[PDB]
Each structure stands twice: as C-alpha cells, then as structure tokens.
Write a protein that binds this ligand. Structure first.
Ligand SMILES: CC(C)(COP(=O)(O)OP(=O)(O)OC[C@H]1O[C@@H](n2cnc3c(N)ncnc32)[C@H](O)[C@@H]1OP(=O)(O)O)[C@@H](O)C(=O)NCCC(=O)NCCSSCCO
Ligand code: NI
Length: 159
C-alpha cells in the first residue's frame, strides 16, 4: 500500500472527523461511554475548531496538523501544539484497521523531523492511564512518564 504524509487542508475536514470518531470509539471502548465520546467528538472535534487548527497549521503558526493518506484517502492523523520551544502532542489517531503497521510511528517521526527543523527539542503528551494501546506505543517510541494529572499520565521525550 501507498501511504503519504502531508499537512491537512480544509478539504480533508469531513474525513478527518470520521476518522477521529471511529478511532475514539475503538480506543476508549473500555473507558468512556458511547454518548460521552459522541459528545466529546461533537464539542471538541467541531467543524469550526478543526478548521481553525488546520489553518493555523497551514500558516506555520502554533499548530502542526498532518495526515496519513492511503492511496489518497485519509486513514490517520497527528496534531501538535507548539508554545515557545516546546511541543505538545495533542492527538494521534488511526482508523483501527490501519493500526499496528507503523503508520503512527511514521506520523510521529515526520512530526519530529519538522519540530527539530524549527529548533523544538521537547515533546510532552497526555495519555489516559487505561489506554494501553497508546501508552505502550509511546514508551516503545522513547517516551517516559514524568507525572500524572487526573486520569492521565504525562509523558515526555527530549531531543
Ligand atoms: C497509538 C497508535 C497511533 C500507534 O500507531 P501504530 O498502530 O501505527 O503503531 P506501530 O508503530 O505499528 O507500533 C506497534 C505498537 O503499538 C501498539 N499497538 C498498535 N496497534 C495495536 C493494536 N491494534 N492492538 C494493541 N496494541 C497495538 C503496541 O504496543 C505495538 O507494539 P507490539 O504489540 O508490536 O509490541 C495507533 O495504534 C492508534 O491510533 N491507536 C488508537 C488511538 C490512540 O491510542 N492514540 C494515542 C493516544 S490518544 S492522542 C495524543 C495525546 O496522547
Ligand atoms: Ni502487537
């Protein structure tokens, strides 16, 4: 299969939401209710907010928003928020069927390459403690737990 990584653009908006929704329902099956997730997707992944984030990424401002496209179809994404010379990994979600094929590792490595080009040398993230899929992926990619906050572990990786 042919997997391409690039910045999202506004035309990706609808497939973006559908991927976010499908990944969330799978990822948080053990953890949140069907309705909580649907509410979160409708409030946080709203067309208006995602569009503003997609634009901020396009304008090389404080967001970096990339997608993984399999033969021209969005199957996953990563989103980073930059403040000063520190990045926070906000979101990294793949369609469940495309997991465990190193597409997420590839998203992560491309984001890392762009960050290093901008002189950013530190990435922090929030991962729910019961999300073993994500958590295990993170420590297998060099992230280390530095703290907790509520239900989440705060993990960090330095370059
Ligand atoms: C977490 C995601 C993005 C990881 O991307 P990949 O699936 O491409 O991971 P790989 O690079 O192939 O690495 C494989 C390792 O990752 C774990 N893994 C991956 N898929 C799994 C499935 N289907 N079941 C169980 N474990 C899985 C394993 O640790 C695996 O290593 P080995 O088993 O080979 O040793 C991706 O899986 C994904 O999108 N997951 C759901 C969403 C999610 O959890 N996202 C990140 C946390 S929320 S967001 C950012 C803020 O933290
Ligand atoms: Ni595995």
């Amino acid at each position: 299969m042919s997997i391409e990584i690039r910045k999202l653009s506004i035309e990706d908006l609808e497939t973006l939401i559908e991927v976010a929704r499908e990944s969330w329902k799978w990822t948080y099956a053990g953890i949140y209710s069907e309705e909580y997730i649907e509410s979160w997707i409708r409030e946080k992944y709203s067309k208006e907010k995602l569009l503003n984030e997609i634009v901020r990424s396009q304008s090389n401002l404080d967001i970096l928003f990339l997608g993984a496209f399999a033969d021209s179809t969005l199957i996953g994404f990563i989103e980073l928020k930059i403040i000063a010379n520190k990045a926070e990994l906000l979101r990294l979600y793949l369609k469940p069927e495309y997991t465990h094929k190193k597409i997420g590792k590839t998203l992560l490595l491309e984001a890392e390459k762009i960050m290093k080009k901008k002189g950013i040398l530190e990435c922090r993230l929030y991962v729910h403690r019961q999300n073993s899929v994500g958590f295990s992926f993170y420590y297998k990619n060099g992230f280390k737990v530095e703290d907790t906050d509520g239900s989440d572990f705060i993990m960090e990786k330095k370059y």
